[PDB]
Design a protein around this motif. Sequence first.
Motif, PDB file in Angstrom:
ATOM      1  N   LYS A  44      -5.073   0.520   8.765  1.00 16.00           N
ATOM      2  CA  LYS A  44      -5.511  -0.666   9.442  1.00 16.00           C
ATOM      3  C   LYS A  44      -4.941  -0.738  10.860  1.00 16.00           C
ATOM      4  O   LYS A  44      -5.693  -0.868  11.829  1.00 16.00           O
TER       5      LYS A  44
ATOM      6  N   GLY B 196       4.981   3.274 -10.452  1.00 15.09           N
ATOM      7  CA  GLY B 196       4.244   3.017  -9.220  1.00 15.09           C
ATOM      8  C   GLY B 196       4.911   3.630  -8.011  1.00 15.09           C
ATOM      9  O   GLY B 196       6.042   3.298  -7.711  1.00 15.09           O
ATOM     10  N   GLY B 197       4.241   4.518  -7.304  1.00 15.03           N
ATOM     11  CA  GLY B 197       4.898   5.126  -6.173  1.00 15.03           C
ATOM     12  C   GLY B 197       4.605   4.447  -4.856  1.00 15.03           C
ATOM     13  O   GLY B 197       4.377   5.083  -3.850  1.00 15.03           O
TER      14      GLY B 197
ATOM     15  N   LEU C 288       6.542   7.390 -11.542  1.00 13.54           N
ATOM     16  CA  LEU C 288       5.221   7.811 -11.878  1.00 13.54           C
ATOM     17  C   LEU C 288       4.370   7.154 -10.842  1.00 13.54           C
ATOM     18  O   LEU C 288       4.612   6.000 -10.475  1.00 13.54           O
ATOM     19  N   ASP C 289       3.374   7.864 -10.359  1.00 12.65           N
ATOM     20  CA  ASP C 289       2.416   7.222  -9.507  1.00 12.65           C
ATOM     21  C   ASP C 289       1.057   7.828  -9.746  1.00 12.65           C
ATOM     22  O   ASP C 289       0.913   9.046  -9.853  1.00 12.65           O
TER      23      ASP C 289
ATOM     24  N   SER D 247       5.108   0.950  -1.933  1.00  7.03           N
ATOM     25  CA  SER D 247       6.093   0.496  -0.993  1.00  7.03           C
ATOM     26  C   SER D 247       7.367   0.176  -1.673  1.00  7.03           C
ATOM     27  O   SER D 247       8.411   0.608  -1.220  1.00  7.03           O
TER      28      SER D 247
ATOM     29  N   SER E 256     -11.459  -2.381   1.068  1.00 14.50           N
ATOM     30  CA  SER E 256     -10.552  -1.674   1.963  1.00 14.50           C
ATOM     31  C   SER E 256     -10.259  -0.300   1.356  1.00 14.50           C
ATOM     32  O   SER E 256     -10.233   0.701   2.065  1.00 14.50           O
TER      33      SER E 256
ATOM     34  N   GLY F  57      -3.883   0.615   3.529  1.00 10.58           N
ATOM     35  CA  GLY F  57      -3.407  -0.692   3.934  1.00 10.58           C
ATOM     36  C   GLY F  57      -2.916  -0.730   5.366  1.00 10.58           C
ATOM     37  O   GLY F  57      -3.614  -0.312   6.305  1.00 10.58           O
TER      38      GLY F  57
HETATM   39  C1  FAD Z   1      -5.780  -3.640   3.920  1.00  8.24           C
HETATM   40  C2  FAD Z   1      -4.334  -3.986   3.817  1.00  8.24           C
HETATM   41  C3  FAD Z   1      -3.578  -4.169   4.954  1.00  8.24           C
HETATM   42  C4  FAD Z   1      -2.233  -4.499   4.818  1.00  8.24           C
HETATM   43  N1  FAD Z   1      -1.481  -4.691   5.949  1.00  8.24           N
HETATM   44  C5  FAD Z   1      -0.156  -5.011   5.843  1.00  8.24           C
HETATM   45  C6  FAD Z   1       0.553  -5.150   7.009  1.00  8.24           C
HETATM   46  O1  FAD Z   1      -0.090  -4.986   8.041  1.00  8.24           O
HETATM   47  N2  FAD Z   1       1.871  -5.487   7.022  1.00  8.24           N
HETATM   48  C7  FAD Z   1       2.468  -5.651   5.799  1.00  8.24           C
HETATM   49  O2  FAD Z   1       3.682  -5.924   5.719  1.00  8.24           O
HETATM   50  N3  FAD Z   1       1.748  -5.472   4.629  1.00  8.24           N
HETATM   51  C8  FAD Z   1       0.429  -5.169   4.632  1.00  8.24           C
HETATM   52  N4  FAD Z   1      -0.307  -4.995   3.486  1.00  8.24           N
HETATM   53  C9  FAD Z   1       0.246  -5.282   2.110  1.00  8.24           C
HETATM   54  C10 FAD Z   1       1.324  -4.280   1.686  1.00  8.24           C
HETATM   55  O3  FAD Z   1       1.015  -2.988   2.144  1.00  8.24           O
HETATM   56  C11 FAD Z   1       1.508  -4.376   0.186  1.00  8.24           C
HETATM   57  O4  FAD Z   1       2.001  -5.685   0.055  1.00  8.24           O
HETATM   58  C12 FAD Z   1       2.563  -3.407  -0.357  1.00  8.24           C
HETATM   59  O5  FAD Z   1       2.168  -2.047  -0.251  1.00  8.24           O
HETATM   60  C13 FAD Z   1       2.934  -3.673  -1.831  1.00  8.24           C
HETATM   61  O6  FAD Z   1       3.823  -2.649  -2.233  1.00  8.24           O
HETATM   62  P1  FAD Z   1       3.959  -2.358  -3.758  1.00  8.24           P
HETATM   63  O7  FAD Z   1       4.841  -1.196  -3.889  1.00  8.24           O
HETATM   64  O8  FAD Z   1       4.366  -3.595  -4.579  1.00  8.24           O
HETATM   65  O9  FAD Z   1       2.453  -2.056  -4.222  1.00  8.24           O
HETATM   66  P2  FAD Z   1       1.874  -0.632  -3.824  1.00  8.24           P
HETATM   67  O10 FAD Z   1       2.555  -0.332  -2.478  1.00  8.24           O
HETATM   68  O11 FAD Z   1       0.385  -0.657  -3.758  1.00  8.24           O
HETATM   69  O12 FAD Z   1       2.396   0.321  -5.005  1.00  8.24           O
HETATM   70  C14 FAD Z   1       1.505   0.518  -6.091  1.00  8.24           C
HETATM   71  C15 FAD Z   1       1.380   1.982  -6.444  1.00  8.24           C
HETATM   72  O13 FAD Z   1       1.375   2.208  -7.825  1.00  8.24           O
HETATM   73  C16 FAD Z   1       0.159   2.803  -8.226  1.00  8.24           C
HETATM   74  N5  FAD Z   1      -0.174   2.354  -9.574  1.00  8.24           N
HETATM   75  C17 FAD Z   1      -0.868   1.243  -9.951  1.00  8.24           C
HETATM   76  N6  FAD Z   1      -0.930   1.225 -11.306  1.00  8.24           N
HETATM   77  C18 FAD Z   1      -0.254   2.307 -11.778  1.00  8.24           C
HETATM   78  C19 FAD Z   1       0.014   2.772 -13.049  1.00  8.24           C
HETATM   79  N7  FAD Z   1      -0.549   2.262 -14.094  1.00  8.24           N
HETATM   80  N8  FAD Z   1       0.670   3.903 -13.279  1.00  8.24           N
HETATM   81  C20 FAD Z   1       1.170   4.618 -12.195  1.00  8.24           C
HETATM   82  N9  FAD Z   1       0.927   4.170 -10.905  1.00  8.24           N
HETATM   83  C21 FAD Z   1       0.217   3.020 -10.704  1.00  8.24           C
HETATM   84  C22 FAD Z   1      -0.855   2.439  -7.178  1.00  8.24           C
HETATM   85  O14 FAD Z   1      -1.862   3.431  -7.135  1.00  8.24           O
HETATM   86  C23 FAD Z   1       0.064   2.510  -5.970  1.00  8.24           C
HETATM   87  O15 FAD Z   1       0.480   3.836  -5.686  1.00  8.24           O
HETATM   88  C24 FAD Z   1      -1.634  -4.653   3.578  1.00  8.24           C
HETATM   89  C25 FAD Z   1      -2.390  -4.483   2.430  1.00  8.24           C
HETATM   90  C26 FAD Z   1      -3.754  -4.141   2.551  1.00  8.24           C
HETATM   91  C27 FAD Z   1      -4.614  -3.945   1.319  1.00  8.24           C
END
Ligand code: FAD
Lengths: 487, 490
Positions: A59, A11-12, A33-34, A14, A172, A55
Amino acid sequence: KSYDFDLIIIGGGSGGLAAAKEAAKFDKKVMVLDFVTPTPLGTNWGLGGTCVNVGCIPKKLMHQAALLGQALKDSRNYGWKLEDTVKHDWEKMTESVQNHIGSLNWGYRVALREKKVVYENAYGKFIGPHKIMATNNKGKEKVYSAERFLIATGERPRYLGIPGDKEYCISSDDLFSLPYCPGKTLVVGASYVALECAGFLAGIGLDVTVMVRSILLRGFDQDMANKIGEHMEEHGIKFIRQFVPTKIEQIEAGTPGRLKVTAKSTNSEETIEDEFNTVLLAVGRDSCTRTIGLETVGVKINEKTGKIPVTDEEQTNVPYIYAIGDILEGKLELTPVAIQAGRLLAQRLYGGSTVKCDYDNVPTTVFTPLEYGCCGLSEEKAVEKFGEENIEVYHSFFWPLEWTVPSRDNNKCYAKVICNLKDNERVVGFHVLGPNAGEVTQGFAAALKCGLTKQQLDSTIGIHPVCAEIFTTLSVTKRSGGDILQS
Amino acid sequence: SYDFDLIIIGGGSGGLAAAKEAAKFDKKVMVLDFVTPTPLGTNWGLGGTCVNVGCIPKKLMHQAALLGQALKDSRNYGWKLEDTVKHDWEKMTESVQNHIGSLNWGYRVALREKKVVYENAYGKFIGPHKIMATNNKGKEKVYSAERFLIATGERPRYLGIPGDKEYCISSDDLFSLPYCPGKTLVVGASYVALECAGFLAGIGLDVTVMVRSILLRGFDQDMANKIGEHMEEHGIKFIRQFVPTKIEQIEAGTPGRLKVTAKSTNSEETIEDEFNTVLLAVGRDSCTRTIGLETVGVKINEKTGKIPVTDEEQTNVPYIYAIGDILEGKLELTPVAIQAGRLLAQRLYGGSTVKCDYDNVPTTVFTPLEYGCCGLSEEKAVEKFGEENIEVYHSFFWPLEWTVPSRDNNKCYAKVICNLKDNERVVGFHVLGPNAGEVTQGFAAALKCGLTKQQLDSTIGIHPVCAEIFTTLSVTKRSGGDILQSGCCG
Ligand SMILES: Cc1cc2nc3c(=O)[nH]c(=O)nc-3n(C[C@H](O)[C@H](O)[C@H](O)COP(=O)(O)OP(=O)(O)OC[C@H]3O[C@@H](n4cnc5c(N)ncnc54)[C@H](O)[C@@H]3O)c2cc1C
Ligand SMILES: Cc1cc2nc3c(=O)[nH]c(=O)nc-3n(C[C@H](O)[C@H](O)[C@H](O)COP(=O)(O)OP(=O)(O)OC[C@H]3O[C@@H](n4cnc5c(N)ncnc54)[C@H](O)[C@@H]3O)c2cc1C
C-alpha cells in the motif's frame, strides 16, 4: 511437563514473527507455523503476514507511486523540463513491489533460521491440550506439543453476502499482485483500506469510484474525515453516497474484464452502475479464529466478531494460550502494536520483565492522497469524555512551502489539536492533514506519552520551513476563532 | 507625546513579528526596513533574510533538487520517463522569485491592514528616543518613540582576500542569479555552505566544497561527518583544509571564469582549476555597527557585533530591545526570532510574563540527506554529564520509499542520547534521513516534556514511516552491535 516446544506460534505475521524473534533470545525451543490460505481467486504469498505481503508494505509503496506522479508534475515549475504527460505502467509497478516483497519474504525465513527458530509452512489447528496439528500444504498432517502457544493468525478480507462478489471481485489480498492494470474501478467501502486504495488507484491515473454505505472513516474524527473526502473528490475520485452493492455480474470475461454492478440505498432506489473493469471490495476483515480448533483447548472467543478477549498481559482464558495482534478483542489492528505486543510478551515470559503493552494513544496515519495523521482522541470523542464545556480546540490551515512554486492546493493541509481545559489544557487530541503526516505525527505521539500540555506545546519552537511547525503556533481557537484562512 | 510608542528597526523575521503583535494592542507602531545592496548590487523587498535570501529560497531549491531525485525514482514505480531530464536554472529562479514577491507584498499589505506604518528607510539612532530614517534617495526624516526594538539581523561575510567582493557571490546573491552558476566552488562548511553546495549539485552542477577545518562546526560531529560522506558519495567534491587566498577573473561573462588559489595548514598552494561561480558564503556579521548605537548608549560586544541582552530581550538601555540573530549568545533562527518578537510585544503591551525559551530548540539542515536534531550533541552531552553517564541508542534505517528505486540502503541514521543519571532522560535527538524536519519537530516537543527513554520506548510507532525507528532504538553504542541489518528482524 515435557513437550516438543516451549512455544509454538500460530501465524507468521507482524506479531507472530515478533514474538518468535524475541522468544529466541532466551534459548527456548520455538516454532512458528505460518500458512496462507488462498483467496477465492487463488492468490497466495509468503512468510511475513498481511502487512508485508498485502498490507502496509504494498500500500505505501503504491501510494508512493502515486505521489511520485504528482512529483513529476510539480517538477516543471522547479525547472525540470518534462513531457506534458507521462504514462504509468501498472505491470512494471507491481513487479517492483512484488520484487521487494519477495526480498522480505526470504529475509524473514532467513532471520528465523539464524535465530534458530523452527519454521514450518503449515496450517495450525489445535486438537487438544498442549497439542496442535499442522497441516502441510500437500495435506500431510503432523502433530506438535508445546508448553505455551501464541495465537497470531490475524484476519482476512470480508466479502458481501451478495452474489458474484467472491467470483469476480477482488480484495486487498488480490490487488497488490494484480497481473493486469485494474482499469476503471469501483471501490466499495469507506475506511482506510478503501480510501487509501481508491486514492492511489486514482493517483496512478485510473477512473476511480468509491461507493459508501454511510459515513467515511467511521471511528476517526469525522471532520478530518470529511476533509479527506472532499479532497479526494477534488482530485478526481468520484463518490456515490449511501449505496451498497446488491449483485455483481460479469458482462465479459477478460483480464480487465467487464463487470456490471447494481446497488440500492436507504432510499429503495437502485442504480445499475455503469460497468467497471475491476471491483475493489475491501469492506472489513474477519479474524481467523474460526477454524483453528479452539474448542479443543477451551479458548473462549467473542462468537460474534471472532476477536479473542484477553488479559492486559495478552493471556486468554486458557493459562498457557496467548494471543496477539489484530485478533485481540478491543485492541487496535496495527502492525506496530502487534509487534510490540509480541515483543514484550516474550520479554515477560522468558525475560522476567513486568512491562505490558500500552494500547493508549498509539499513533496512526491513513495514507490517502492527502495524508492524515492523528494521535489521541477525536474532537467529538473528546467532548464526550470531557464535556464540550471543557474542551478547547486550536486549529489552523497551512500551505506546504513545497506547494507554492507548483501553485496548488492552498488552504487544504490542516492541523488541529484538542485540549482539556480541566487539565492544564493537556493536549488529548492531535490531528494533521498534510504531507508526510506520519513523520509529523510520530514525534507528537511521544509527547502525548509525556502528558504534553498546550502551554508546553506553545513553548516549543518550530523548525522552519517545515509543515509540522504550525503545531508550534496554534493560536486560533475553534470556539471563537473566525478565520483561519490564509491571513 | 513621542511620535510612535514603538519603532522597529528591521523588517525581518523578528521585526515583522513584533509589529504584528504589538499592533493588536492599538499602539502606534512603525517598522523601518531597508536593504543595503550587496557589492554586486543585488536587492530585495520587505521580509528580511529568511524570506528573500534565506530559508524560503533555500528550501525551494532544495526541493528542486529533491524532485530531480524524484524523477529518477519514478521509473521503478512505473512512470516511463526519459533517461535524462535537463534542468533550467532560469525557470527555477523565476518561480522562486515570483513566490518571494508574493511574500514581499503580502507583508506590506499585512502591515497596512494592521495599521502599522511601514517606511522603506534605513534606521540610525541620533539620540535618546530619536531615530533618523534615511530614505532611498537620501532624504532624511527623524522620528521619536517611547521604545525601540533593534531587529536588523546580519549579512554575509567576505574573506579578507582580493577579488572576493568583486568576483564572488554569497547567499545574498545566489537566489537571484540571473544565470546558471555553472561549475562552482563553495567556500565554507556550515549549514549555508553545505546546503547550497548540496542543491546546486542535485540540480546537476559540478560542485566542490572547500573546508577550512571540520564540517558543521557546532553540530554533533559524527552526524556531520555522515552528512559529509553522503554528499561525497553523491558527486560533490571536497577539498579539505584549505582557504582561498586570491580570486582572479580569467574571463568576464555571465557564467564567467574565475581562477581560485588556496593555501592550507600545510604551506602548500593549489590553483584550483577555475570555476564559473565561487559561492563565498562563510559566516554572517550582525548589522549593529552603522546604526547610531553610540548616540543612545547601547552596549554591544565589539568583537562579534552581537547585542548582549536580558532574559527579556532588554538591552542595557531600558527602552531599547533587540531580537533575532543580533542577540548575543542566542540562536540565529527564524522561528526563534519570531517567538521572541511575538512574546516581547506580549510582555510589553499585553501584560504577560512569558519569556522566550531558548533551550532545546530543534533545527534541521537541508543537505541532500536532511539532518534534524534537537538538544545536545553526543559529545556535548558527555561533556555536560560525563561519559560514564551517557547511554546512546542508535540504528540505521531504510526509507520504504527507497527500496523500489533500490538505493542508499543503510544510510539514514537515527540516534538518541540519554542521561543515565536522570532516568535516561533523552537530552539529545539526531536523525539523518528524509523529511528530517517533519520528523524532528514532534520530538522537540517531547523534549520540552522531559521525554525519558522508557517513555520513548513505550510510544508505539507509525508504520511504515521513517520516524518510527525512534520508537524502537534498542542497540546501544556502548555495547556496539552491528546496526547494519537490511531486511528483517521483527
Ligand atoms: C491493506 C492494509 C493496509 C494496512 N496498512 C497498515 C499501515 O499502513 N500501518 C499499520 O500500522 N498497519 C497497517 N495494516 C494492518 C496491519 O498490517 C495488521 O494490523 C498486522 O499485520 C496484524 O499483524 P498480525 O500478526 O496480528 O496478523 P498478520 O500480520 O496478518 O499475521 C497472520 C499470519 O498468520 C497466517 N495465518 C492465518 N491463519 C493461520 C493458521 N491457521 N495457521 C497458520 N498460519 C495462519 C496468515 O496467513 C498470516 O501470515 C494494514 C492492513 C491492511 C490489510
Ligand atoms: C542562507 C540562509 C539560510 C537560512 N535557512 C534557514 C532555515 O532553513 N531555517 C531557519 O530557521 N533559519 C534559516 N536561516 C536563518 C534565518 O534566516 C535568520 O535566523 C533570520 O532571518 C533572522 O531574522 P532577523 O529578524 O533577526 O533579521 P532578518 O530576518 O535577517 O532581517 C533583518 C532585516 O532588517 C533590515 N535592516 C538591517 N539594518 C537595517 C537598518 N539599519 N535600517 C532598516 N532596516 C535594516 C535588513 O535589511 C533585513 O530586512 C537562514 C539564513 C541564511 C543566511
